[PDB]
């Protein structure tokens, strides 16, 4: 909000001359806010003031004496033309659905075509189209070849205001590396894809640079014939020319006595204006506005919580009745009795295959009696537990 703080815009001479002996601070308009939705709406309502009225003729479709055959004449009840012998009787008159009728509601010449925008809202949009004619992120996004343009804002001398021939004028644009946007103007020269071609707008190009000047010694004649270029006075400043299309960031070339006068037209960040009586510059909703510096920022960063980071995808429900590794996870002590019954079930087996095999009683070695006669003689391994453990 507080205005200059990238200040010293340098004046460039004819020969692009990386400075001069002059140096101007930013005229404080260029830190006033660029709201691109105010400008879109203010531009839109204001370019309707050049419209012309259209309407159909007020007596068209209604030049017939046609009444209705009613019913029951086997034909539908619309106003049919009267007489005889001429293809036109009795044919269908007066209706939107008829062929020759009046249109559904005819267009009238007292539509509201023009518009009243608040004056303070057309000052808001002019200001947001001058603060975007600095900022080379925004001139570079309206197209606008400016990667060889010296400074933003381009201030040039008052010697450009005396250019008198179009030959001299294109050298200035050549020397200041402005000509690469004119060459993009010639490559955009087309025909319209209407309908507008029959209505006197077949076409020429797209838009180029805007030369804001203060006095006109010769430069509106000299820049008149170059495509894409137009010259404008400081005090007027059309918004329709400074943000064409409702879009911000036109490449604008000031002169120096058209850059001295922006502290008079629009006010300053301390005082009001001189030439727009009562106007103060609009205040933004955000002074600092760099969300990148703010999100760092150690006043903010020392109070935040934590990013606590593990992300919980974490789904499938396993069935803990045919699983065991999900049953022994949810209920340990399932494991304890699942072992305590499976160990007793393995002990019921040995007492059965022993008591059956008393009619065969073969072995005692490894084949069908490893899982039998080994544990039948590991009760000697619990003869120790009664005998040697009574020493405590």
């Amino acid at each position: 909000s507080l205005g200059n703080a990238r200040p010293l815009v340098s004046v460039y001479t004819e020969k692009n001359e990386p400075a001069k002996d002059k140096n101007i601070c930013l005229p404080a308009v260029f830190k006033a806010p660029i709201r691109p939705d105010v400008v879109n709406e203010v531009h839109q309502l204001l370019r309707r003031n050049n419209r012309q009225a259209y309407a159909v003729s007020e007596l068209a479709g209604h030049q017939t004496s046609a009444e209705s055959w009613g019913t029951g004449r086997a034909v539908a009840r619309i106003p049919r033309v009267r007489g005889g012998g001429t293809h036109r009787s009795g044919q269908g008159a007066f209706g939107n659905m008829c062929r020759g009728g009046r249109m559904f509601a005819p267009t009238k010449t007292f539509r509201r075509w023009h518009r009243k925008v608040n004056v303070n809202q057309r000052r808001y949009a002019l200001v947001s189209a001058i603060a975007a004619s600095g900022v080379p992120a925004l001139v570079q996004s309206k197209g606008h070849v400016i990667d060889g343009v010296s400074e933003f804002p381009l201030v040039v001398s008052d010697e450009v205001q005396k250019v008198q021939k179009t030959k001299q004028a294109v050298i200035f644009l050549r020397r200041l590396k402005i000509w690469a946007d004119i060459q993009k103007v010639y490559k955009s020269q087309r025909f319209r894809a209407g309908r507008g071609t029959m209505r006197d707008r077949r076409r020429i190009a797209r838009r180029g640079p805007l030369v804001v000047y203060d006095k006109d010694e010769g430069l509106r004649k000299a820049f008149r014939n170059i495509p894409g270029i137009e010259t404008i006075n400081v005090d007027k400043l059309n918004l329709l020319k400074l943000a064409p299309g409702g879009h911000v960031g036109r490449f604008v070339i000031w002169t120096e006595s058209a850059f001295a006068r922006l502290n008079d037209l629009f006010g300053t960040w301390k005082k009001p204006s001189t030439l727009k009586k009562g106007y103060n510059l609009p205040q933004p909703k955000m002074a600092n506005t760099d969300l990148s510096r703010l999100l760092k920022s150690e006043e903010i960063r020392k109070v935040l919580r934590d990013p606590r980071k593990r992300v919980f995808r974490s789904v499938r429900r396993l069935n803990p009745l045919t699983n065991v590794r999900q049953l022994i996870k949810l209920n340990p002590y399932a494991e304890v009795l699942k072992r305590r019954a499976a160990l007793a079930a393995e002990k019921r087996t040995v007492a059965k295959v022993l008591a059956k095999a008393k009619k065969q009683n073969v072995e005692l070695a490894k084949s069908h009696f490893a899982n039998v006669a080994t544990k039948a003689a590991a009760n000697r391994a619990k003869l120790l537990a009664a005998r040697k453990k009574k020493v405590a």
């Binding site: 080379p136 309206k142 400074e151 879009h247």
Partner: protein, 134 residues
Amino acid sequence: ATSSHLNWLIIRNNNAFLLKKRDVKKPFSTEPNNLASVSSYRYSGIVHKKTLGVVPAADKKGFTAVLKKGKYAQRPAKNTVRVDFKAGPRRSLKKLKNLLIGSKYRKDLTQAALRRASAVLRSQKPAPVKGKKA
């Protein structure tokens, strides 16, 4: 007016380089210093000086001549050369993608530039590779 987060919201739905392309909802943007042509936030034209552009060549079909970051010391009001500082690695594939990860000691856009450079070198690889095809 100074910020890039402000600058983006002024352009994030209409600029000269935004390419809306009818179905896959937003991947494209054609500005000359993007590195992954998407309109994202700051893979973008002007970032105010971490606009990293890996480009060929200049001598096609040589090498990856990198338009680098343009950073602070001009205003960033742009050139007649003033703001842009343009350094170009060559000679290999392995020993210039290391002298571009080394020219960028700071890490964020590096791996978009290490994939745009590794695809410019592939894009002029068919002048040596993929021969006569008998």
